[PDB]
């Protein structure tokens, strides 16, 4: 019974269905909240939901030649906790 | 080593104080349980057809030609919410027989040992795991080798010096710009060529890529003393 | 390694619109809870599959400009950019070779079919030029005349033998991916793992709907029918007979539903180890990254599924 969302000015169609109440940006961010087809939403300011495509990491070119080589020099050690039941 | 490592653990005291999403597969074990055990005795409540949900409601009322239709109607309706309990309860099984078997081969390999495995015992190199307790669970701390700086150099895959080519026995061949060195591919230690440190094979016409240096040799100072 | 998604509306499938139906139903307690519970929880878990499969680094590398890998040619799995489809050569063959209104519904998958395929592009350029080192660290350059002199090193062979004999092992390396144009192109047997998923669970939901037909002991098979023909002191007779048919029909697909759901759990579990065993780095395990000596390794995408690439010695 409710229409209280069926305002307008805020309607973007995606391949899962159709999502009002949220704005369509142009960027690209890590979401949190899936909602399908890569589209994603989140909470970016004032402030209201806002969706767009999920990122799929920073680029990263690496160089390579034929006589191009790379050695490390310095060394850090981690610790890290795995939960299994 | 011993700075970076005290200073390791002491990052998982505060992480694991701070926040409480990093157990979040031994919460759903627990409110998985106790969202099976509810349901099963809310279902007494409902009537599944008959004319109460109370067995003494039905007996204190009725007569006994009809009171064996109304109770039929109440064992057939609760018998299936057993029977869908112990079911759910019996695929929940082997979803941890499975994770029970995979901390028991983590046991035998991380901890009691040292496995070569990618990305089984930790990310990067493996050198060291605790074993620690948790309520249904287990937890690991794994100590890892990670580089962390680099620096590029200019390579070669072989050297020939006086019509034989040289091969490096253990790791590569880099180079500053003047001189040629063997350092090893995992930390950069610059050392001189020398004959304990090549292996001869063959000549240098066949190998592509191969550069022109002179190879040390440890039999002159002493020759000649 | 994934499966396809689905939802069962409760009171759609047993009433048909009807507010009769749905006032019998509210006596049975949960029973519409526990069977939307069960499937949320199968369409949560195939998206999860995808991530610990694929999603295994989070820098996106990319092929260098100029193609000089020593005599090496990976023109077939190296993507192509003029193309609309961000794929390679194989992945496009290996699509063509695999193949409603009543409360059933398919739920779209999360990462679609290009965001598959860039994973697979950044793997594929960290074991050329990187190669065993972008999984423990950064990526460091390594000439690829000079990777497989290692590779050679891990199964005990000495690298006189790589370096003396390059145009050798590339004419080789470049016959052998030109075979699996030809055998997989001709017979179409081959991928008749990823078929038997999708085979399996379209029998499961053309069951439910044939099952909508049968009276189960009552005067017909419409709910209007029955609303229609007699009077609400007999008519809540014939619909207790088919509230009851039709609740046995929908446990038992999400039990069988349960079940296949994990061996596919227990598929992704195996292709997730093998994606970083294999294809990461070197292993030494017998019968496991392959016949024989292990070498390299190079995924590629399937629907509903991973193909590999095994290479040997």
Wanted: net charge neutral; proline share 4%.
């Amino acid at each position: 019974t409710w229409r209280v969302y069926s305002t307008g000015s805020n309607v973007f169609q995606t391949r899962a269905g159709c999502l009002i109440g949220a704005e369509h940006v142009n960027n690209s961010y890590e979401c949190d909240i899936p909602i399908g087809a890569g589209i994603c939403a989140s909470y970016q300011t004032s402030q209201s939901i806002i969706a767009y495509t999920m990122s799929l990491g920073a680029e990263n070119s690496v160089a390579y030649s034929n006589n191009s080589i790379a050695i490390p020099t310095n060394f850090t050690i981690s610790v890290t906790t795995e939960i299994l039941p | 080593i011993a700075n970076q490592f005290n200073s390791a653990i002491g990052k998982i005291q505060d992480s694991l104080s701070s926040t409480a999403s990093a157990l979040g597969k031994l919460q759903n074990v627990v409110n998985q349980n106790a969202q099976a055990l509810n349901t099963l005795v809310k279902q007494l409540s409902s009537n599944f057809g008959a004319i109460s949900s109370v067995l003494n409601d039905i007996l204190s009322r009725l007569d006994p030609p009809e009171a064996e239709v109304q109770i039929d109607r109440l064992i057939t309706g609760r018998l299936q919410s057993l029977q869908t309990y112990v079911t759910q309860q019996l695929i929940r099984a082997a979803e941890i027989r499975a994770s029970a078997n995979l901390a028991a081969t983590k046991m035998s390999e991380c901890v009691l040992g040292q496995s070569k495995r990618v990305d089984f015992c930790g990310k990067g190199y493996h050198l060291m795991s605790f074993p620690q307790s948790a309520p249904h669970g287990v937890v690991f701390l794994h100590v890892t080798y990670v580089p962390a700086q680099e620096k590029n150099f200019t390579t070669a895959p072989a050297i020939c010096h006086d019509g034989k080519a040289h091969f490096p026995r253990e790791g590569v061949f880099v180079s500053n710009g003047t001189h040629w060195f063997v350092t090893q591919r995992n930390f950069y230690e610059p050392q001189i060529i020398t004959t304990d440190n090549t292996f001869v094979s063959g000549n240098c016409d066949v190998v592509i890529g191969i550069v022109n240096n002179t190879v040390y040799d440890p039999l002159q100072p002493e020759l000649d003393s | 390694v994934s499966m396809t998604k689905t939802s069962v509306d409760c009171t759609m499938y047993i009433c048909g619109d009807s507010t009769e139906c749905s006032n019998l139903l509210l006596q049975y307690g949960s029973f519409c809870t526990q069977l939307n519970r069960a499937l949320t929880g199968i369409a949560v878990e195939q998206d999860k599959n995808t991530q610990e499969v694929f999603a295994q680094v989070k820098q996106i590398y990319k092929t260098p400009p100029i193609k000089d890998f020593g005599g090496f040619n990976f023109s077939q799995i190296l993507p192509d950019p003029s193309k609309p489809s961000k794929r390679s050569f194989i992945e496009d063959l290996l699509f063509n070779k695999v193949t409603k209104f009543n409360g059933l519904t398919v739920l779209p998958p999360l990462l679609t079919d290009e965001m598959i395929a860039q994973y697979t592009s950044a793997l594929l350029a960290g074991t050329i030029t990187s190669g065993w080192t972008f999984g423990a660290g950064a990526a460091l350059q390594i000439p690829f005349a000079m990777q497989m002199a290692y590779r050679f090193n891990g199964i005990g062979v000495t690298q006189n033998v790589l370096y003396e004999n390059q145009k050798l092992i590339a004419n080789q390396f470049n016959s052998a991916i030109g075979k699996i144009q030809d055998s997989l192109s001709s017979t179409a047997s081959a991928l008749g793992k990823l078929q038997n998923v999708v085979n399996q669970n379209a029998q499961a939901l053309n069951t439910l709907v044939k099952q909508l037909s049968s009276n189960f002991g009552a005067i017909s098979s419409v709910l209007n029918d029955i609303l229609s023909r007699l009077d609400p002191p007999e008519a809540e007779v014939q619909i207790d007979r088919l509230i009851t048919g039709r609740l046995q029909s929908l446990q038992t697909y999400v039990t069988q539903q349960l079940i296949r759901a994990a061996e596919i759990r227990a598929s992704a579990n195996l292709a997730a180890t093998k994606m970083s065993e294999c294809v990461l780095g070197q292993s030494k395990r017998v019968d496991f990254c392959g016949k024989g000596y292990h070498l390299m390794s190079f995924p590629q995408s399937a629907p509903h599924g991973v193909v590999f690439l095994h290479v040997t010695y």
